[PDB]
Amino acid sequence: GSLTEDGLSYKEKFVVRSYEVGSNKTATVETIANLLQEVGCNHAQSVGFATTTTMRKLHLIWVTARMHIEIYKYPAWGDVVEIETWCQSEGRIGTRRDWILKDSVTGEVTGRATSKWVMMNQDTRRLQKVSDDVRDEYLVFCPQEPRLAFPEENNRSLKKIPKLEDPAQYSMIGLKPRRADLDMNQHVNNVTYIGWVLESIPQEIVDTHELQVITLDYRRECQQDDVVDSLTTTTSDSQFLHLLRLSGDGQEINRGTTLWRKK
Amino acid sequence: GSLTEDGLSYKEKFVVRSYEVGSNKTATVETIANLLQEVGCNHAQSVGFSATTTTMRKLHLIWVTARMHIEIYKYPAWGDVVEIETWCQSEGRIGTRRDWILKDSVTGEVTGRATSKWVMMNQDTRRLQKVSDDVRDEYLVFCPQEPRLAFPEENNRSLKKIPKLEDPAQYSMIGLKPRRADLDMNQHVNNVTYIGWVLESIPQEIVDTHELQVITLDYRRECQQDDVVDSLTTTTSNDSQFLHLLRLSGDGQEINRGTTLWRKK
């Protein structure tokens, strides 16, 4: 992959692997989400990083608060997918990363994504909010005019997600992270939560529908010693409301929505 | 990737990804095992397959892994390019063998090697059967004629007999369940998932002070989506060696047995 001519975005091509595809011989949403993280990490490396010099000094990190993915066409096993990604300042509230997924052969948009990231202290886990010093540092790597993957005035990526009420229609209890679910820093990586949400979707919807939209809120991180319950209720195309909480006390870790289209 | 000049082996290069590396900033053994199956599947596609021969598809027969043996001298770091060469070999009526050689693309040095035993089984009845002549003639044209072993040595680890772990186990990991991400396109539990399940019962202190050098795994029975697995480990030893057992949480039906060798960092 490489930075585009202007140096304000990054593009990478990915050949879809045999083990990255699901039952319908196309890339899973867990595979797409890994590719979005991979192209994001590579964009950061190519511009000198995801923390800045004064972020390392204050022990500050960027953490995902929201992830929103919309897939029109999943790439098949063997196909080449092109992903373009860019960052954008969103005032002192945080930062945004956006993605555009394309078929490398036809040049057609097959998917798009957006994510909200906020600043927190690595040690106390407290939201410190963006400062002017840590704004000019990476503003030089972002387009100045707004560049939104989801431009539309009041789109799905900015919708308020409510809290699922008990009893849930569907559930998947006792979900636990394994060593393969952790990153190089030993934290549960964000893709694991997406798979945990989708575990409570009934197999009949998985077999007759394809996932088109997924919005996820990140409230709290799951530790290696924590256990997760995945809850789902139909609210309708088929639409679901999702909740991830700790098996024990019921502490919320995530909430979300999924939209599914008939095959 | 592509077939080599003689058409008897296949090579592919892989750039190591950010999410494919562990705490050590190097590719996990679960990542290496995925890359070995990826290069194996691509070798099969380049020689006219979609694993099964024309005769195997007629009889509802498939190839299934009976044993996997991996030896890693140096794990590739995040961003490095790894070259993998793979080839198949007939073993008479017993089955086939798939071997791998892993190299650093920059230095050209061998950083790992692997071997695997595969037997023929009826897809429907799950009954093992010896390789017939019509099947053996169809794939021998894609395999080297002279023996080409990834592990040539006269007393190599890939052919060692693995015993059954006795209760009580020293270490354990209870309630392991496969998720939808752990299944392949045919809805079967992915072979790599068993490797991760074995390594779940390794204590965190060995993971932090040692690196995995060798892993031999036997496949006795496949785990279903509705099955629950218990992972058991006992130390049997400068190097640390373990005996592994995977069994169904309920009745205690064996699914796998193995050994791991770990060297100090």
Ligand SMILES: O=C(O)c1ccc(O)c(Cl)c1
């Ligand atoms: O194989 C599939 O279609 C598949 C894979 C993963 C997962 O999250 C779901 Cl809901 C389906």
Ligand SMILES: O=C(O)c1ccc(O)c(Cl)c1
């Ligand atoms: O991150 C690691 O070190 C790691 C990852 C997977 C795995 O199974 C083991 Cl034992 C260790």
